[PDB]
């Protein structure tokens, strides 16, 4: 009866912990997107710049 309401409190605390889980997952994803975007940008730089090196040569 009373410990059952405490189990409801535990349900809420588990939901909060799972929200932390979702958030830390999001953070890992965001950082990997950082690596992907930087790789795309620097790929563009290398490509266009080496093209201009070709043209200048």
């Amino acid at each position: 009866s009373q410990t059952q309401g405490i189990q409801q409190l535990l349900q809420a605390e588990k939901r909060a912990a799972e929200k932390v889980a979702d958030a830390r997952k999001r953070k890992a994803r965001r950082l990997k997107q950082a690596k992907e975007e930087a790789q795309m940008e620097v790929e563009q730089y290398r490509r266009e710049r080496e093209q201009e090196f070709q043209s200048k040569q």
Partner: protein, 49 residues
Amino acid sequence: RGNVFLRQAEIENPLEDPVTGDYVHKSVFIIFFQGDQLKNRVKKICEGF
């Protein structure tokens, strides 16, 4: 705003009391809050009285 669960029991066949020596029957009425400052104030009044 007493709004937390009650854990209550009755203890009979007592023993001599720590601070008076009274061989007096007891009964616990337990209500706990997870507030920290609330826990501190409750501890203050409970220990004092």
